[PDB]
């Protein structure tokens, strides 16, 4: 496990990116729901 500071910064960035992407995905899903025409 030779993960030094540059490596640690990457881990943190990826965690944040991952969470924010899930939020976007959540929001886009809902955009899709309302973009449906009735019937
Ligand atoms: Cl975050
Ligand atoms: Cl996307």
Author numbering: 1 to 39
Please give sentences taken from the publication describing this entry.
Here we report a new antimicrobial peptide belonging to the cathelicidin family, cathelicidin-MH (cath-MH), from the skin of Microhyla heymonsivogt frog. Cath-MH has a single α-helical structure in membrane-mimetic environments and is antimicrobial against fungi and bacteria, especially Gram-negative bacteria. In contrast to other cathelicidins, cath-MH suppresses coagulation by affecting the enzymatic activities of tissue plasminogen activator, plasmin, β-tryptase, elastase, thrombin, and chymase. According to the amino acid sequences of known frog cathelicidins, the predicted mature cath-MH sequence (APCKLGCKIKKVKQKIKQKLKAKVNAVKTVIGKISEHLG) possessed 12 strongly basic residues distributed across the entire molecule, resulting in an 11 charge at pH 7.0.
The small trigonal-shaped crystals of the peptide were successfully grown under Crystal ScreenHT (Hampton Research) conditions of 2 M ammonium sulfate over 60 d at 277 K. While cath-MH crystals diffracted X-rays to 1.95 Å resolution, the crystal structure was solved at 2.20 Å resolution because the initial resolution did not provide a complete non-protein 2Fo - Fc electron density map. The peptide crystals belonged to the rhombohedral space group R32. The crystal asymmetric unit contained one molecule of the peptide with a solvent content of 41.76%. Loop-1 was formed by the first four amino acids A1-K4 at the N-terminal part of the structure, and loop-2 contained the last four amino acids E36-G39 at the C-terminal part. Non-protein electron density was interpreted as 13 water molecules and two chloride ions. The stabilization of the α-helical monomer was provided by a disulfide bridge formed from sulfur atoms of C3 and C7 and by several H-bonds between O atom C3 and Nζ atom K8 at 3.15 Å; between O atom Q25 and Oγ1 T29 at 2.70 Å; between O atom of I31 and Oγ S35 at 2.92 Å; and between Nζ K33 and Oε1 E36 at 2.68 Å distance. Further stabilization was realized by interactions between Sγ atom C3 with Nζ atom of K11; O atom of Q14 and Oε1 Q18; and Nζ atom of K17 and Nζ atom of K21. The monomer was more positively charged at the N-terminus than the C-terminus and shared high secondary structural similarity. Finally, compared to cathelicidin-PY, cath-MH contains a larger helix and five extra hydrogen bonds.
